[PDB]
Amino acid sequence: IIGGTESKPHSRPYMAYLEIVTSNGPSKFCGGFLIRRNFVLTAAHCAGRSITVTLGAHNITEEEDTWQKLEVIKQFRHPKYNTSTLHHDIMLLKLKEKASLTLAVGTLPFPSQKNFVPPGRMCRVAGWGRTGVLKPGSDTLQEVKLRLMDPQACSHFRDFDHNLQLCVGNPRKTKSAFKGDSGGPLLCAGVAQGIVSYGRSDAKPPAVFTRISHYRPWINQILQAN
Ligand SMILES: CCc1ccc2c(CCNC(C)=O)c([C@@H](C3=C(O)[C@@H](c4ccccc4)CC3=O)c3ccccc3)[nH]c2c1
Numbered sequence: 001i002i003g004g005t006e007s008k009p010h011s012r013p014y015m016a017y018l019e020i021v022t023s024n025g026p027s028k029f030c031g032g033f034l035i036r037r038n039f040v041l042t043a044a045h046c047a048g049r050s051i052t053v054t055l056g057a058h059n060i061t062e063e064e065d066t067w068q069k070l071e072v073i074k075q076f077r078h079p080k081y082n083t084s085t086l087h088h089d090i091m092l093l094k095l096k097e098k099a100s101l102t103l104a105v106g107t108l109p110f111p112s113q114k115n116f117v118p119p120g121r122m123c124r125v126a127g128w129g130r131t132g133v134l135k136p137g138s139d140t141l142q143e144v145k146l147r148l149m150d151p152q153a154c155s156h157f158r159d160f161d162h163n164l165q166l167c168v169g170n171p172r173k174t175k176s177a178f179k180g181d182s183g184g185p186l187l188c189a190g191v192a193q194g195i196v197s198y199g200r201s202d203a204k205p206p207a208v209f210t211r212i213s214h215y216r217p218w219i220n221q222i223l224q225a226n
């Protein structure tokens with residue numbers, strides 16, 4: 001998160017810190033959010049050979065009693081996820097066991113309504129990702145308020161699609177998500193409407209987020225069958 005503030009510790013109890021393991025390189029990092037006691041929603045590009053989930057964290061360098069380190073049994077990447085266009089950047093992680101409910105750890109279930117969110121309003125995003133283009137990931141959970149932009153603002157992303165994705169962040173403001181934040185939620189009036197996906201390498205807003213409303217049928221399908 002670039003240009004944000006430190007979250008009040010444990011104020012977003014659904015937030016998940018993801019360590020992504022692969023065979024031929026060191027750990028990489030994403031965000032996610034707990035939508036059921038044994039399911040975390042995140043981005044498909046965060047898939048790996050294996051993934052570890054930490055719930056209940058604020059400062060990720062200091063072990064505390066709120067931490068729950070949880071094993072992932074299976075990854076459900078969207079079947080149409082495309083590494084060229086980056087369409088359908090969404091994935092569900094099934095946890096080996098159900099998380100414990102505490103003050104610091106709880107679910108963020110979707111409401112029944114699944115209306116299409118138009119441009120104009122302000123939303124908030126949180127994560128442990130880089131605090132600048134040339135800076136390291138944050139030790140503490142950070143968050144920032146970003147504006148939903150008209151789709152033409154994201155035209156320069158040639159594979160952007162208004163029906164599939166949200167266009168997020170006023171170009172005139174030095175505020176954004178960045179690397180390490182992918183997979184985290186964008187909340188609009190307390191409701192998750194987007195998932196952090198991708199933007200420019202230089203972090204100039206706006207950036208591209210998965211539009212959750214479009215994927216509600218797929219999400220429901222996976223949850224009901226698993
Ligand atoms: C919205 C905020 C924002 C803005 C810009 C980016 C970019 C930079 C995108 N640069 C391009 C596409 O030119 C990225 C890319 C990136 C990660 O997510 C990190 C990563 C962690 C775990 C597994 C794999 C990778 C390491 C990395 O390089 C990335 C890679 C693969 C597909 C999509 C995104 N994420 C972003 C998020």
Ligand SMILES: [Zn+2]
Pocket residue numbers: 009010058064066
């Ligand atoms: Zn604490």
